[PDB]
Amino acid sequence: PAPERMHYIKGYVPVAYSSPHSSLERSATWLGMGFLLTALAGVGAVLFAVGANSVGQQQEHWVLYSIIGVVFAVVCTVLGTVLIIKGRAPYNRYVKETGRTQ
Amino acid sequence: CEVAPPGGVLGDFLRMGWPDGITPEAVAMGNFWSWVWVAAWIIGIIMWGLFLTAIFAWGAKRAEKRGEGEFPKQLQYNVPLELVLTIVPIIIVMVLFFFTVQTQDKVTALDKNPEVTVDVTAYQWNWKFGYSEIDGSLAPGGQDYQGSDPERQAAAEASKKDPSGDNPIHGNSKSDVSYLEFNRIETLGTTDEIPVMVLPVNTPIEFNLASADVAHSFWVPEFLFKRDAYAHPEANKSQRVFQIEEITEEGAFVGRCAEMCGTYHAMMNFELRVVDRDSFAEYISFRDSNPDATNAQALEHIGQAPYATSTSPFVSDRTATRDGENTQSNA
Amino acid sequence: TAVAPRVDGHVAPQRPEPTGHARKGSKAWLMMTTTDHKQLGIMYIIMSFSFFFLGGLMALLIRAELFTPGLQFLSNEQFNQLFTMHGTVMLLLYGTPIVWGFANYVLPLQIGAPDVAFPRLNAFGFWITTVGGVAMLTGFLTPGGAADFGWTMYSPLSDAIHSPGLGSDMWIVGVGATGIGSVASAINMLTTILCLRAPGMTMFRMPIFTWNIFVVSVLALLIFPLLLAAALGVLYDRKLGGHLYDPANGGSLLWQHLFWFFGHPEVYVLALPFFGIVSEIIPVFSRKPMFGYVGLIFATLSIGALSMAVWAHHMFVTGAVLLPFFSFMTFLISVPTGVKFFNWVGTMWKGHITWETPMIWSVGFMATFLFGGLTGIMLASPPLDFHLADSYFLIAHFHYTLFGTVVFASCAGVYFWFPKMTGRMMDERLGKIHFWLTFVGFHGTFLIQHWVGNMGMPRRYADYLDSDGFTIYNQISTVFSFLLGLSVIPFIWNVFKSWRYGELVTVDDPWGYGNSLEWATSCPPPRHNFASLPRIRSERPAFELHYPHMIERMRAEAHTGHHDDINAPELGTAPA
Amino acid sequence: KHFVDPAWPEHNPADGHVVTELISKVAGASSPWGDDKEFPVSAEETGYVHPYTRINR
Amino acid sequence: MKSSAKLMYGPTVFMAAMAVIYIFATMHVSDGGSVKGVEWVGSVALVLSAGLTLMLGVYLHFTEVRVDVLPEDWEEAEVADKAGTLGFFSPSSIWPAAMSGAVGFLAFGVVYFHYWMIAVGLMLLIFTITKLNLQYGVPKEKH
Amino acid sequence: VAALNRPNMVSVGTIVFLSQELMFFAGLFAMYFVSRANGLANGSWGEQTDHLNVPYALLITVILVSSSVTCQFGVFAAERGDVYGLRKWFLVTIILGSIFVIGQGYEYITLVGHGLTIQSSVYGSAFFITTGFHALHVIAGVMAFVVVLMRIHKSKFTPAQATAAMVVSYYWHFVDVVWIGLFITIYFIQ
Ligand code: HAS
Ligand code: HAS
Ligand SMILES: [Ca+2]
Ligand SMILES: [Cu+2]
Ligand SMILES: [Mn+2]
């Protein structure tokens, strides 16, 4: 397999998205992206519940809709976030190990 | 929306051609519409202004005549700004969705306590109206009035299965019509006559839609509302009833078919005429007493014009309309 | 980084010949037999513009008959046939094939491949699309005529019991064949991106047109099988006596759900590639990089995900779909579609804009499409769509929006890549005449339709009464419709004249600041695209190739943050 | 011992197979003419005999 | 091909989420503008769509795990790393147009529902696909 | 000095094509399930599945999975470079696929013999559209195997013919999976 880092002289700065340490290939990141997109549906759910309540309907279930909305939103947000961070770990240690960010 | 629009000529521009609306929920929808156009015009103005700024400030000849050089500043990323410009749309559409849910839940409710229920049948290519229920306070005689014609409804109910055994659709006959409604007082539209549905003012009304063959749609632009009328609405899980809390003001209002249904789709018009509460009691009493009398005669009897006014029947001749006059008049 | 030896006896490779110098017999048998992706792309584009003229002629007949209240020369049946076939031709024989034609031409030039993955499957896609077109239009040769149930083919109106003519069958097999063409093209493009990129052309160095072609290939592969399945179900029902779409089987809404699960992703399949063409054009004439490149990729893929969940906002007035779910989903997919405008403004922000024809067409696209999308969010809200569904307001919405993408940005692509395609430029003055005619005619046609739709006119109405109050609006709209129809006369003349007598291109990049790789090769490219390849390091290699003194500058200015890693130490040691 | 086709490439046995369903040693399609072949060849070893045709004028 | 294989898990997770959400919602939630009950078209459609993206993501990942570091998947590749053979590509073929014509004959037979047209179109189609797939292998004539 | 491993391009194309064929069958399954919902709304569906013949369907299921195992043995033969093992196993797979389609044709003939037709019920319509499209896909698969045998008869067995054989095996695995799913829905849970 190819080495961990490649030859950069001083003064050279790359465009380095597909590098081996970039979170755009580490699989955790894209799952976290999926879950972060998915979390917004729970915000939609709680808003639908509260809006239906405010005009006097959905009265037998709007508290349950609010509960499932907020818990779905928060668990998707949380596990998607931590998955993003687990994808972005190698780049962070790269940024520590050398002065290079780009 | 509860909040009224700005009104005046500004309101006339903002509502952008919408009728004023002859129900309370039409007023709510029109309000919401005008406010979302205040928002939309703000967005459109500022972004068209950016596209004009591009024409008149960010040009290359203007930049070269003031010594900017060959290239601009090769900026490509601004993580905070391209975050903020994404997060602001989200919190915009969330508020839009909140108000959307409020208005939709008010319009779409089925707990308005209807006093008059009309059974509507669409077919290729006209309408049939009939009074299913008229609760007592305006009913003929004062007792809560049911409209079903039991013999004819029973014939339609018996058409649910073929005696010769050709029953392919889940055990039922292919030409089942037991979902359709047959009442005693009915008005039936024809190529020669527009069907005029008479209704009372200030009364909660229910409409019950269905079609004899093909999908149609029941668009009254003055209600600011339409729904599709289907054949076998329950097999399609299509909610076939809708309710309005009242019609606020009386008059004659056009209504059109708003789903493609074939050749004469554009000729499938009806009129919704709205009269006083006591005048409607008189109309329904007259029709119930002498059921041979027509719709025009009852309309004359309560002091209204016999035939529709907001719309007219079409000349059926396939060429006579060529020089403009496509409407045939009635006495 | 290695450096070659200044080799002896070196002279640049020979330039291929431009168009218009052809001997007789040079393209007949080649057309019939070629597997060259770029001749196939030219054939796609010519074919789709011919169908554009057909469908638009149908539309101008529609506008002529709506000019005054009575039926002056058309019947109700013929008007129904006309709008049905106008819709079908413009969406399935102009739109999708021009998408795949532009993809076929420029994509292997953008990623640095010689061919596409499956050349004969590419040829098959072209020919099956042409046969689908011929089949679909053959219905007009019957005595009864074409299909007349709208391009949506709603049921039970599409059952044999309710539409028995043979044209109703021909329409089905037409759209089926066109879908077969699309899936062939989609397979090709996806494999070609996965398997034939150039050295150093990593995924996050491809241009944005390539990314959009990626995601729309995925969408097309999702959806076109489903349309073929549903429509062969309809043809099964009609021919064999089946009952799947029987109304008592819930068949009406079965059809509507299936159709729109195909059909909304199809309008995104038509929108995204032309957004990509505009994202190619805008940075070239601003002399500035494409702003927010990775963010644009994420927005594109976000649309690709969301498009499969927003489908049933075409069914709000059916009284049979859960309203808040699809309303919220539509409100969400509005967000990444709108982020693209912010990125294009960032690409123009304090640039050095020059107004050649493609920049004019692209900014006209932006101005046109903004209003269409603003109109779209009103339909996303069911309280408003209760009034606006199947009104002329909807016509105005999707015409603003489908002209914004598939017409304005299609002409932008034509002007932008005509030099590369042919080795010749087009006449800039005739292009500006084309643009202003199209612009004036278009806004004069479809702006006033918002008002007449709000006022109560339904769509698909052959005839109306002079008491409705619709007449004056229809008259204004039809006058500007004929103007918009005249707009194609300078366009056809410009293409024809410039193809054989146009100004010759003497440079690899006649606009000067070409970002993508297609401007690193000659005009026209050789048979296998590249006589030599440059170092790919940015997402705009051609710019780095032609202006090396800028390669220090852009890397310093790329980010707003105060990144200091141009003073970082050496990393690695030696090998490469 | 098991059979191998005479047109099949020889290979390092540690490197698996010439081709398998997931992977190949080439970016496009393998050639029908054997990838072990190197083209062009001499016209003498293609066997094409170019005719000499004279028609009456 | 790492990023390509991995970005297919965004839409997979999203479409699976929307499938389960849509299913539970359409069966349990009630509003006055629809009838309660699980909506089977959107259910099957979304789960099979997540199946398609799952299919591509999993196959491409299972391939990616045993392909070498290619120059086109490398940030500092030299242009001479792909020097050599790239692969075989068809230079020309009459059989794509032939296949389109076969499918046209089949489709018009289906339209009119002439049985002989359906038979002949299917025969033409199998023939033309076979001749396409035998193009670069037909023997030299042995006379 | 040796050459790098790359994705087999033809396999990638075949897998993309098979993904979109799965999405074809999605729609027929959705039609089936909508029909089944309407049919269980008044208990008529069960009276139409009272014509089914589960042991025989399980038999032809066993035959089809055996044929898929067979074509994978042929894949192994191909990738080793052996034309004769491939040429044996693919013929066995063609025999087993022929047996499948003949058994399915007999199943149709007996179902028509006592009621079930496209026109007699909604159940018959759904049943015959789904199983008939699948049988057409099986017939296209055996056509594919025969064309492979011709290809390796009259062209030398290079890796280019081996890749063709392997992707035709992929196609047969797809039809086998579609059958397992269709068998699980229309015969077991019904
Ligand atoms: C190229 C082809 C198309 C594109 C792209 C397109 C985009 C949208 N459409 Fe659409 N459309 C609908 C909604 C939208 C929405 C929300 C968007 C969005 O993509 C729009 C987003 C784009 C923008 C350009 C937004 C503004 C941009 C910016 C940068 C500002 C930030 C945005 C904010 C703050 C959100 C705006 C908020 C405001 C308060 C204004 C709906 C329902 O919500 C229906 C069905 C209605 C019915 O059945 O009557 C519909 C119907 C159609 C048809 C019907 C054909 C038929 O006969 O049935 C076609 C062909 C079509 C094409 C296309 N449409 N559309
Ligand atoms: C990409 C997709 C589309 C494009 C582009 C498009 C372009 C137009 N459309 Fe449209 N369309 C309508 C009007 C137009 C007009 C006027 C144009 C224009 O772009 C057409 C002009 C374009 C041309 C390309 C014309 C070429 C001109 C020629 C060939 C003649 C030039 C020569 C002249 C004038 C003589 C020279 C005279 C001298 C004095 C020199 C209208 C209403 O005015 C409706 C609703 C109808 C109804 O009743 O609901 C409609 C319906 C649809 C539908 C729904 C179909 C359905 O409901 O079943 C779709 C999907 C669609 C798509 C598209 N449409 N359109
Ligand atoms: Ca007129
Ligand atoms: Cu949509
Ligand atoms: Mn509708």
Residue numbers in the entry:
A (entry chain W): 11 to 112
B (entry chain R): 29 to 359
C (entry chain Q): 2 to 577
D (entry chain X): 17 to 73
E (entry chain T): 1 to 143
F (entry chain S): 16 to 205
Give the article text.
Here, we report the high-resolution cryo-EM structure of the cyt bcc-aa3 supercomplex from Corynebacterium glutamicum, the prototype for such a complex. The dimeric cyt bcc complex is located in the centre and on both sides, a monomeric cyt aa3 oxidase is attached.
We purified the cyt bcc-aa3 supercomplex from C. glutamicum and determined the cryo-EM structure at an average resolution of 2.8 Å and a local map resolution up to 2.5 Å. The semiquinone transition-state analogue stigmatellin36 was previously used for Qo site characterisation of the ubiquinol oxidising mitochondrial cyt bc1 complex37 and was added to the supercomplex prior to cryo-EM grid preparation. The cryo-EM map clearly resolves stigmatellin bound between FeS and haem bL with respective distances of 6.9 and 12.7 Å. One H-bond is present between the carbonyl oxygen atom of stigmatellin and the FeS ligand His355QcrA. The other is present between the hydroxyl moiety of stigmatellin and Tyr153QcrB, whereas it is H-bonded to Glu272 of the Qo motif in the mitochondrial cyt bc1 complex37. Taken together, the binding position of the transition state of menaquinol and ubiquinol oxidation and thus the structural basis for electron bifurcation is strictly conserved. We identified two pathways for proton release termed Ex1 and Ex2, which start at the catalytic site marked by stigmatellin. In cyt c oxidases, dioxygen reduction takes place at the binuclear centre (BNC) comprised of CuB and the iron Fea3. This catalytic site is resolved in detail in the supercomplex oxidase with azide bound at the BNC. In the supercomplex structure, azide ions are resolved in the centre between CuB and Fea3 in protomer 1 and closer to CuB in protomer 2. Here, the cryo-EM map reveals the position of a dioxygen molecule in a pocket formed by side chains of non-polar amino acid residues of CtaD (Trp152, Trp172, Val176 and Leu93).
